[model samples]
Target: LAAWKISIPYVDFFEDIPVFCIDVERPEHWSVYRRYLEFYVLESKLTEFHGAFPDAQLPSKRIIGPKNYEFLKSKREEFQEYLQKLLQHPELSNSQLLADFLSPN
Candidate 1:
């Protein structure tokens, strides 16, 4: 699917919004997309953390504590691996939102 840009009101920063609406065409996959979005947010957080600690192997447990950080770190790694596979979809890789999220500062 080609990417489309639109305007979304009420956002404080930008009126323009980039949206990718997936058509599951069924109700069963709703939870799957929800979970995917949740993991995406986790990946974004990991990127933000790396901006502060470029060569960090493990992030501070302050955000999730030691045990939880271990779990989150594993998930972040998993998400990144799969995300690389999706880069064949150039629109996704080139998204400004993604660029900003993965950017270091």
Candidate 2:
């Protein structure tokens, strides 16, 4: 589970977000499975990232400001396009854990 904050200036509230917690059984035996599991777990964090920086993009390595707002916005658009493709793909979108993890509960 992850703690997601309510967005606002000087806010002191948070929401407890639920995620699929998996027990890694025999890490050495399931090496390949571990790798894929790790990726999806990281993918789950995108929801948290959006919670923190809803206006930022994955391609934007820095904060969006006046001088680079347009550039970041463009990057965000590009990233959204990529995200859309992933969201539409059955292999990813059909995964129950991933779907729940990425959801904005």
Candidate 3:
């Protein structure tokens, strides 16, 4: 599967929160918009519900501070790598939680 960063994080009128637009290609192609914390939540759940992947790592979270377009670009790339790295776990390849996370619904 190829995970990609479709666009830099951007804020919207709905919640005025920055969102990452990520696209994934596995069973099929799909896109998902999520805040950084949602990624954190996914990692947490993966470790909690599924099994822990000690070697996988996520991008470090920053304090409440500025997030310029250029800076957010790095976050986008980092998350793309995080997805790829986390998915390397053989046992989690068919985990239910992962399916839910990538679900189009």
Candidate 4:
């Protein structure tokens, strides 16, 4: 057999084609490249996380966004105050007061 066939690995071959097209004035290709980057990061994170922990053991790490800083701190303080008030005044079991504090975001 003297014949040879050319084959392209679709993953690697198509990966940079969008970027190359985007560099050549293809706006649609640019959006595709952006989506590819997002998909890549998600895939990488999934592999990294799974490798670090088996299905039975959850990784202790969590994603903490800088935007969540004020929300987390204020919510914890308010929740503590809420528990203190609930313990001090059983009468505040009034539905209206309970409704005000039961907001879940």
Candidate 5:
């Protein structure tokens, strides 16, 4: 797969929960809303089932008062670049785990 133009416009809070709304359109427009834990889980599985990225890591968690507006705005960039690198990585994108993640397409 070719490198895609990925967009993570913003991370917003839902009624009582927050989600990272990631959308992409390199091949065709597709979107998925991922919570913070969801992103962490994917990384965890990628490490557990796949393997680890030597110099890579997910954003650190803040158990206290993460709901602030500016905080998540900054966090969005972290996840944006994170996924960009993840998707562009030659090995990880086509793996089975990521394949089914966008399964509806």
Candidate 6:
């Protein structure tokens, strides 16, 4: 999980008090399925022109920051199942051309 810290120095004139705050963005935007799809479809082709790897590995295990994932149980499960199916498909899994699964054009 990511970590964030905000520190406020003590102000003697006001209260000589310091405030520390921390926050984390759960499941970075790029990890979201929708975001991933966009990255796969649009950004990938664009970045490919600049030498970015098109067949990049997706992060299965990650340090997701603060996330209210409890509510996304069903949605996450659905996405996971969908991904598993794609991964299991012989045609998709056995294909040597990464472009077929991630890109066509």
Choose the strongest candidate by TM-score.
Answer: 5
lDDT of 5 by residue, 1-105 (tens): 755567789776666577777877664787767777777777778767656564457866778875566766778887888877777676675777765553332
Candidates, ranked, TM-score:
5, 3, 1, 2, 6, 4
Error of 5 at 4 (Å): 3.8
Q: Which regions of candidate 2 fall more than 4 Å away from where they truly are?
A: 1-68, 96-101
Q: Order the candidates by lDDT, highest first.
A: 5, 3, 1, 2, 6, 4
Tell me the TM-score of model 5: 0.77
Off by over 4 Å in 1: 1-67
Better by TM-score, candidate 6 or 1 = 1
- In order, what is each prediction's RMSD in angstroms? 14.9, 15.2, 4.1, 24.9, 2.7, 17.5
Weakest lDDT window of 10 consecutive positions for candidate 5: 96-105
Measured with C-alpha atoms, the lDDT of residue 58 in candidate 6 is 32
* Candidate 2: residue 31 Cα off by (Å): 35
| Residue pairs in clash, model 5 | none
Question: Each model's TM-score?
Answer: 0.33, 0.30, 0.69, 0.22, 0.77, 0.26
- Report every candidate's CA lDDT: 0.34, 0.32, 0.62, 0.28, 0.70, 0.30
Candidate with maximal lDDT: 5
13-43 per-residue lDDT for model 2 (tens digits): 1233111222211212110111112333445
Clashes of 5: 0
Preferred candidate (TM-score higher): 1 or 4: 1
Flag regions of model 5 displaced more than 4 Å. Answer: 100-105
For candidate 1, the 10 contiguous residues with the lowest summed lDDT are 5-14
| Residue pairs with clashing backbones, model 6 | none
